[PDB]
Amino acid sequence: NSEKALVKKLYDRYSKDTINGKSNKSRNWVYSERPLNENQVRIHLEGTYTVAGRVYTPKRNITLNKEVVTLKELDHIIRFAHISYGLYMGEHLPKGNIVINTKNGGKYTLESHKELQKNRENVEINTDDIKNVTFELVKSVNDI
Ligand SMILES: CC(=O)N[C@@H]1[C@@H](O[C@@H]2O[C@@H](C)[C@@H](O)[C@@H](O)[C@@H]2O)[C@H](O[C@@H]2O[C@H](CO)[C@H](O)[C@H](O[C@]3(C(=O)O)C[C@H](O)[C@@H](NC(C)=O)[C@H]([C@H](O)[C@H](O)CO)O3)[C@H]2O)[C@@H](CO)O[C@@H]1O
Secondary structure: OHHHHHHHHHHHHHOOOEEOOEEOOOOOOOOOOOOOOOOEEEEEEEEEEEEOOEEEOOOEEEEEEOOEEEHHHHHHHHHHHHHOOOOOOOOOOOEOEEEEEEOOOOEEEEEOOOOOOHHHOOOEEEHHHEEEEEEEEEEOOOOO
16 A cells, blocks of 8 residues: 555654654644743644545644754654644545745745655745744545
């Protein structure tokens, strides 16, 4: 099963709770309502995950330090938060984009069906520039 293997590759990459010395502490890469320090931001994931034509609206957010990070890092943490509601589980690949929206109207688009392209890994992003993350993801079939 090749579709299953492609799913497993995305799951194995993005389910890791560390990257480059950062880690998911206190569920900060999943969901928090805890008060923010002056040096933190909270980026809300606002979107839909539609499975076999039924829309789900999972509520997740990521709590990060204010700093310049790489797109590899932000892509990682964002997809980790998606995995926490069920993204990349089972045997079928999702499709659709996850979009990092910036405060002045910029975007970084993360295509969900494949890994981040290697040539994008080192793009530098100030976490304080991020407005939110939107997404419209589709999994065409349920697992049987
Ligand atoms: C085969 C392959 O992977 N080739 C990639 C390019 O990806 C292909 O071409 C794209 C135009 C698109 O059709 C894609 O589906 C193809 O796989 C890749 O180009 C980037 O691809 C991503 C999506 O995977 C985005 O479309 C990106 O555009 C944007 C973005 O939305 O992310 C536009 C945006 O305005 C811009 N924002 C800023 C602030 O600069 C961002 C940003 O530059 C990047 O996200 C930072 O990485 O890009 C396409 O540029 C291309 C560059 O990675 O490499 C191969 O050619």
